[PDB]
């Protein structure tokens, strides 16, 4: 409580390792006050701050993070994309099902895997419908994930 | 590489062998009934090297006591630690070699040898991973010499993958007035050059000189000489008995010490040299100990180290002392004496520090040297042999006991070859 | 995606448990393998699973194997504080050691245990989705460190072809020197492993002994003192492979960046700051110290050679602008000679995770640290020292009979030395 105000002002700070350490801290404690400042750190100049803000937003869970994380699946950095996909899987919001399906055709193995894992964690009915459609009208890795989900779910 | 099997042959072998047990049993915290009554955890860490854990908390020496003279059997058992030895491990004859090598190597000794091999086979079986063998004997008599070297050859042929190490006591006219001793010594040296991996040269001439010239022992007994031997055997085997890196096992020590298979005869040394029961006085420092390591007066073999070059050196410091002090003193002794160390063997001087000091001393140093100056020892025996053998004097005592004259010629050839070999490496340069 | 660590002989095994002590501390893993919510590192994303498999319990087990031809050293691992961390099948021991003889570790005694070790590695390889390769720890001077490593390296090339093999080698010193024949064992291992290793990081026992006395003020440094330091440097080298970092991520990135000629694969590592716990250093200071011969893992003069590669791995409180500024001064101010055909490019990596020190260790906790990896011609000085020592003893054929009696041919000594001569010529010729 008394320390949450501190790390929120360290997230703003000039020094990149200090900004990184502020985002690591706010994920370790996880207060509802840290949501909007960590949402701003998703658009940070440094990839090591962006990826740990994304991991923090997934741990805390707040719904306000669902939209900036959806845009974060399109981040230039492979680690930021994997951490954003996994965060959306932790939150489990059905608004993330289609952007996560688009991440199944990413150039990075970890990102593809992270998107597959996230979809499995959400596993509603809209996920199932999208998996059914992808199992029939889908290709390669993205098809394997649809087919594997429907076989892990009798 | 864990267990070591000990064999002690003849009069000298059993005397010096029993003093070794008396001393290391006290060091390891063992009483004459085989019960551990010590305090340090380190005393029992590598106890399985020289002892068997027969029954409960009880420890037994892995020792085989041999002699063709049955008198030795009672001497051992009536002694201080006589009750710890296995009763079945005493193999004694009813005859004697009468200081004849042929009697111990071919006649009376060869009759009893198979009974001894039965006992060595027994002890080799209750061994998890046998390192090797250790023989304590005299080269000047008939039993320790003839039967002892028959045993060495018989063990070498049975256990060839195992290390064969000896504590051989060299005859001297100063100590024994027996005439045929050069024959017994030359015939044994010939066996040792071929069938041992490491031989500690304990010269009775050096032992007498230390007692007479330095300890001021007016007319020393064997008890006075054996005090030097037991202290040396205690210090040279320290690495093998306590937890340590450098020369921990017989093979690891053999690798570091032996560059050439025939040049395996070591000049042992000790510091400080205290007379039997002469009240402990003046605490030595690391520099005083290091100086007494190189000092010819402190050598257990009658050779000047300054009359040769060192091929390899193993130094063992015992007690509570600075590692910085030992490292400093062993570095100076090499640089300020570079001429006495072989240039072509990089880092040939190996130092070791054991925190457990010996009985009665707060600090001690043991020296094991493979110096080319040990040819002086063999030259002395060859000169002694030649004077007699030229005339073929008393050869009938040996040839009558199923030996040949060519055996005498082969022994003489081998010992002269060994001396020439020591000379070649003494004269050898790195260039 | 995964790396297997092999720890051979006394040096390798002892270094391995010092490494693993630090890895656990770095990733927030307890000595039992548990990683609870209070001790979990915090900042999400973690790639430590390249080195630790995960059990159904939540227990993190090292993807490590420990081999020794005698039980003494691994018994200490089995009874130590980390007895719980490793599974019993990972720790392999014989009875009779190699007695500081290469031929015993490679032929006689090594041939007895090689097959079991391989099946134990196979158990680990079978738990890997995409095994990148191996990290091999061993000494040059021990019979097992030299002999068994080369025998295993030979067998891993056949059993695992397209798999990287990066070594961490204990280069001998006269200070911590348990054998006369260490130069023989060193030349023999380097000859037989050369065609099987992809990269080799040497640790010169004389350099670490010198660093402990100079930087940590230890009067007569013991194996405990040296090992805490080795593991600090080693962790900084392997950090790339265990963390979500951009430079030297997989074993291939390490080979690609650091090694341009195949035989010449011995990078010299430097590390700053090495402070005794008894004053804060900047990015400029720690970068500058990397180019100081006093701070090197191996004793050599880089001003006398040419570079083929130069990587700077920073960790902790390290700001991008400060790193750029520090590098810029080093380009303009220093006399760093690179070979013509390779570009004068300093590959930089920054991890903002604070440095983790050994509690009860001789090392102080610093804000920032740096580990430089340089592929220099100067490392031929380390080879020359060894080769001369070898030549002294070999000319008189001293100790050779111990090798020929343990399943080895004397010609393998001449063959070995010939390969070293070629390696020395290669470093000389490449640096014109
Ligand atoms: N830095 C470091 N060096 C060590 C350590 N243990 C041994 N050494 C060095 O390694 C060399 C000896 O080789 P070892 O690793 O002990 O031998 P080994 O692989 O167990 O082989 P064998 O002795 O034949 O059983 C010498 O240079 C020692 O100083 C250690 O824990 N750390
Ligand atoms: N130092 C020492 N030498 C001894 C001892 N007993 C005999 N010797 C020497 O050993 C040689 C004789 O060997 P000995 O053991 O009596 O004959 P064996 O019974 O036939 O082996 C002579 O050179 C003696 O000086 C002893 O207890 N100590
Ligand atoms: Mg070992």
From TrEMBL, chain B:
<dbReference type="InterPro" id="IPR017975">
    <property type="entry name" value="Tubulin_CS"/>
</dbReference>
<feature type="binding site">
    <location>
        <position position="99"/>
    </location>
    <ligand>
        <name>GTP</name>
    </ligand>
</feature>
<feature type="binding site">
    <location>
        <position position="11"/>
    </location>
    <ligand>
        <name>GDP</name>
    </ligand>
</feature>
<dbReference type="InterPro" id="IPR008280">
    <property type="entry name" value="Tub_FtsZ_C"/>
</dbReference>
<keyword id="KW-0460">Magnesium</keyword>
<keyword id="KW-0479">Metal-binding</keyword>
<feature type="binding site">
    <location>
        <position position="143"/>
    </location>
    <ligand>
        <name>GDP</name>
    </ligand>
</feature>
<comment type="function">
    <text>Tubulin is the major constituent of microtubules, a cylinder consisting of laterally associated linear protofilaments composed of alpha- and beta-tubulin heterodimers. Microtubules grow by the addition of GTP-tubulin dimers to the microtubule end, where a stabilizing cap forms. Below the cap, tubulin dimers are in GDP-bound state, owing to GTPase activity of alpha-tubulin.</text>
</comment>
<dbReference type="GO" id="GO:0005525">
    <property type="term" value="F:GTP binding"/>
</dbReference>
<dbReference type="Pfam" id="PF00091">
    <property type="entry name" value="Tubulin"/>
</dbReference>
<feature type="binding site">
    <location>
        <position position="138"/>
    </location>
    <ligand>
        <name>GDP</name>
    </ligand>
</feature>
<feature type="binding site">
    <location>
        <position position="12"/>
    </location>
    <ligand>
        <name>GTP</name>
    </ligand>
</feature>
<dbReference type="InterPro" id="IPR018316">
    <property type="entry name" value="Tubulin/FtsZ_2-layer-sand-dom"/>
</dbReference>
<dbReference type="GO" id="GO:0046872">
    <property type="term" value="F:metal ion binding"/>
</dbReference>
<feature type="binding site">
    <location>
        <position position="11"/>
    </location>
    <ligand>
        <name>GTP</name>
    </ligand>
</feature>
<feature type="binding site">
    <location>
        <position position="226"/>
    </location>
    <ligand>
        <name>GDP</name>
    </ligand>
</feature>
<dbReference type="InterPro" id="IPR023123">
    <property type="entry name" value="Tubulin_C"/>
</dbReference>
<feature type="domain" description="Tubulin/FtsZ GTPase">
    <location>
        <begin position="47"/>
        <end position="244"/>
    </location>
</feature>
<keyword id="KW-0547">Nucleotide-binding</keyword>
<feature type="binding site">
    <location>
        <position position="98"/>
    </location>
    <ligand>
        <name>GTP</name>
    </ligand>
</feature>
<feature type="binding site">
    <location>
        <position position="181"/>
    </location>
    <ligand>
        <name>GDP</name>
    </ligand>
</feature>
<comment type="subunit">
    <text>Dimer of alpha and beta chains. A typical microtubule is a hollow water-filled tube with an outer diameter of 25 nm and an inner diameter of 15 nM. Alpha-beta heterodimers associate head-to-tail to form protofilaments running lengthwise along the microtubule wall with the beta-tubulin subunit facing the microtubule plus end conferring a structural polarity. Microtubules usually have 13 protofilaments but different protofilament numbers can be found in some organisms and specialized cells.</text>
</comment>
<dbReference type="InterPro" id="IPR000217">
    <property type="entry name" value="Tubulin"/>
</dbReference>
<feature type="binding site">
    <location>
        <position position="204"/>
    </location>
    <ligand>
        <name>GDP</name>
    </ligand>
</feature>
<keyword id="KW-0963">Cytoplasm</keyword>
<feature type="binding site">
    <location>
        <position position="138"/>
    </location>
    <ligand>
        <name>GTP</name>
    </ligand>
</feature>
<feature type="binding site">
    <location>
        <position position="144"/>
    </location>
    <ligand>
        <name>GDP</name>
    </ligand>
</feature>
<keyword id="KW-0342">GTP-binding</keyword>
<dbReference type="InterPro" id="IPR003008">
    <property type="entry name" value="Tubulin_FtsZ_GTPase"/>
</dbReference>
<dbReference type="InterPro" id="IPR013838">
    <property type="entry name" value="Beta-tubulin_BS"/>
</dbReference>
<feature type="binding site">
    <location>
        <position position="143"/>
    </location>
    <ligand>
        <name>GTP</name>
    </ligand>
</feature>
<dbReference type="InterPro" id="IPR036525">
    <property type="entry name" value="Tubulin/FtsZ_GTPase_sf"/>
</dbReference>
<feature type="binding site">
    <location>
        <position position="181"/>
    </location>
    <ligand>
        <name>GTP</name>
    </ligand>
</feature>
<feature type="binding site">
    <location>
        <position position="222"/>
    </location>
    <ligand>
        <name>GDP</name>
    </ligand>
</feature>
<feature type="binding site">
    <location>
        <position position="142"/>
    </location>
    <ligand>
        <name>GDP</name>
    </ligand>
</feature>
<feature type="binding site">
    <location>
        <position position="141"/>
    </location>
    <ligand>
        <name>GDP</name>
    </ligand>
</feature>
<feature type="binding site">
    <location>
        <position position="99"/>
    </location>
    <ligand>
        <name>GDP</name>
    </ligand>
</feature>
<feature type="binding site">
    <location>
        <position position="177"/>
    </location>
    <ligand>
        <name>GDP</name>
    </ligand>
</feature>
<dbReference type="Pfam" id="PF03953">
    <property type="entry name" value="Tubulin_C"/>
</dbReference>
<dbReference type="InterPro" id="IPR002453">
    <property type="entry name" value="Beta_tubulin"/>
</dbReference>
<feature type="domain" description="Tubulin/FtsZ 2-layer sandwich">
    <location>
        <begin position="246"/>
        <end position="383"/>
    </location>
</feature>
<comment type="similarity">
    <text>Belongs to the tubulin family.</text>
</comment>
């Amino acid at each position: 409580p008394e320390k949450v105000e501190m790390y929120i002002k360290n997230l703003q700070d000039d020094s990149p390792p200090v900004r990184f350490n502020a985002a690591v801290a706010l994920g370790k404690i996880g207060d509802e006050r840290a949501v909007e400042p960590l949402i701003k750190a998703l658009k940070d100049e440094d990839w090591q701050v962006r990826k740990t803000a994304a991991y923090a937003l997934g741990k805390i869970g707040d719904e306000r993070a669902v939209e900036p994380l959806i845009k974060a699946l399109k981040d230039e950095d492979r680690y930021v994309r994997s951490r954003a996909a996994l965060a959306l899987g932790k939150i489990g919001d059905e608004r993330a099902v289609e952007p996560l399906i688009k991440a199944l055709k990413d150039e990075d193995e970890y990102v593809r895997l992270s998107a597959a894992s996230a979809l499995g964690k959400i596993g509603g009915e809209r996920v199932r419908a999208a998996m059914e459609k992808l199992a029939e009208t889908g290709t390669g890795f993205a098809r394997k994930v649809a087919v594997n989900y429907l076989e892990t779910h009798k | 590489m864990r267990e070591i099997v000990h064999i002690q042959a003849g009069q000298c072998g059993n005397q010096i062998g029993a003093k070794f047990w008396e001393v290391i049993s006290d060091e390891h915290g063992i009483d004459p009934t085989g019960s551990y009554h010590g305090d340090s955890d380190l005393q029992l860490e590598r106890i399985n090297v020289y002892y068997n854990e027969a029954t409960g908390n009880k420890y037994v020496p892995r020792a085989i006591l041999v002699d063709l003279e049955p008198g030795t059997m009672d001497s051992v058992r009536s002694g201080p630690f006589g009750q710890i030895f296995r009763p079945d491990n005493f193999v004694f004859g009813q005859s004697g070699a009468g200081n004849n090598w042929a009697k111990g190597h071919y006649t009376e000794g060869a009759e009893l040898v198979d009974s001894v091999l039965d006992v060595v086979r027994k002890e080799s079986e209750s061994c998890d991973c046998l390192q090797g063998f250790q023989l304590t004997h005299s080269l000047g008599g008939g039993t320790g010499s003839g039967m002892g070297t028959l045993l060495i050859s018989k063990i070498r042929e049975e256990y060839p993958d195992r290390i064969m190490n000896t504590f051989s006591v060299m005859p001297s006219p100063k100590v024994s007035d027996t005439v045929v001793e050069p024959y017994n010594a030359t015939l044994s040296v010939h066996q040792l050059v071929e069938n041992t991996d490491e031989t500690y040269c304990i010269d009775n001439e050096a032992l007498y000189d230390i007692c007479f010239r330095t300890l001021k022992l007016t007319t020393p007994t064997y008890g006075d000489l054996n005090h030097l031997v037991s202290a040396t055997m205690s210090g040279v085997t320290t690495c093998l008995r306590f937890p340590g890196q450098l020369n921990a096992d017989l093979r690891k020590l053999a690798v570091n010490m032996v560059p050439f298979p025939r040049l395996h005869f070591f000049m042992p040394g000790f510091a400080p040299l205290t007379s039997r029961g002469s009240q402990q006085y003046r605490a030595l420092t690391v520099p005083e100990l290091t100086q007494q390591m190189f000092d010819s007066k402190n050598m257990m073999a009658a050779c000047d180290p300054r009359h040769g070059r060192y091929l390899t050196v193993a130094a063992i410091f015992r007690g509570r002392m600075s590692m910085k002090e030992v490292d400093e003193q062993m570095l100076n002794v090499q640089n300020k004496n570079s001429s006495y160390f072989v240039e072509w063997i990089p880092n040939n001087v190996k130092t070791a520090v054991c925190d457990i000091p010996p009985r009665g001393l707060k600090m001690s140093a043991t020296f094991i040297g493979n110096s080319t100056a040990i040819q002086e020892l063999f030259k002395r025996i060859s000169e002694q042999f030649t004077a007699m053998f030229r005339r073929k004097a008393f050869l009938h005592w040996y040839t009558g006991e199923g030996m040949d004259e060519m055996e005498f010629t082969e022994a003489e050839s081998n010992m002269n070859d060994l001396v020439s070999e020591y000379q070649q490496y003494q004269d050898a340069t790195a260039d | 995606r995964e790396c297997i660590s092999i720890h051979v002989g006394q040096a390798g095994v002892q270094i391995g448990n010092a490494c693993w002590e630090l890895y656990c501390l770095e990733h927030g893993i307890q000595p039992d393998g548990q990683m609870p919510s209070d001790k979990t590192i915090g900042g999400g994303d973690d790639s430590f699973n390249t080195f630790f498999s995960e059990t159904g319990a939540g227990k993190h087990v090292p993807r490590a194997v420990f081999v020794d031809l005698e039980p003494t050293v691994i018994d200490e691992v089995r009874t130590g504080t980390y007895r719980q961390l490793f599974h019993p099948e990972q720790l392999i021991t014989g009875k009779e050691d190699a007695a500081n003889n290469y031929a015993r570790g490679h032929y006689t005694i090594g041939k007895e245990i090689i097959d079991l070790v391989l099946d134990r590695i196979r158990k680990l390889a079978d738990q890997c989705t995409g095994l990148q390769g191996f990290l091999v720890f061993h000494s040059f001077g021990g019979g097992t460190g030299s002999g068994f490593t080369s025998l295993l390296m030979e067998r891993l090339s056949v059993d695992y072809g397209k798999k990287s093999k990066l070594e961490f080698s204990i280069y001998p010193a006269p200070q911590v020197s348990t054998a006369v024949v260490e130069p023989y064992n060193s030349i023999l291992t380097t000859h037989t492993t050369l065609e099987h290793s992809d990269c080799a990081f040497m640790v010169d026992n004389e350099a670490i002994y010198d660093i402990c006395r100079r930087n940590l003020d230890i009067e007569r440094p013991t194996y405990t003192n040296l090992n805490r330091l080795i593991s600090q440097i080693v962790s900084s080298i392997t950090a790339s492979l265990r963390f979500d970092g951009a430079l030297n991520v997989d074993l291939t990135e390490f080979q690609t960046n650091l090694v341009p000629y195949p035989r010449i694969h011995f990078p010299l590592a430097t590390y700053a700051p090495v402070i005794s716990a008894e004053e804060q250093l900047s990015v400029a200071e720690i970068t500058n110290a990397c180019f100081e011969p006093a701070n090197q893992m191996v004793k050599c003069d880089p001003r006398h050679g040419k570079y083929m590669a130069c990587c700077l791995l920073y960790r902790g409180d390290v700001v991008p602008k400060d790193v750029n500024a520090a590098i810029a001064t080093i380009k303009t101010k220093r006399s760093i000679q690179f070979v013509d055909w390779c570009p004068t490019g300093f590959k930089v990596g920054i991890n903002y995770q604070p440095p983790t020190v050994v509690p009860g260790g001789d090392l102080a906790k610093v804000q920032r640290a740096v580990c430089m990896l340089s592929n220099t011609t100067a490392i031929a000085e380390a080879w020359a020292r060894l080769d001369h020592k070898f030549d002294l003893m070999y000319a008189k054929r001293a100790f050779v009979h111990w090798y020929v009696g343990e399943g080895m041919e004397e010609g393998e000594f001449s063959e070995a030395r010939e390969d070293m001569a070629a390696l020395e010529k290669d470093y000389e010729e490449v640096g014109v």
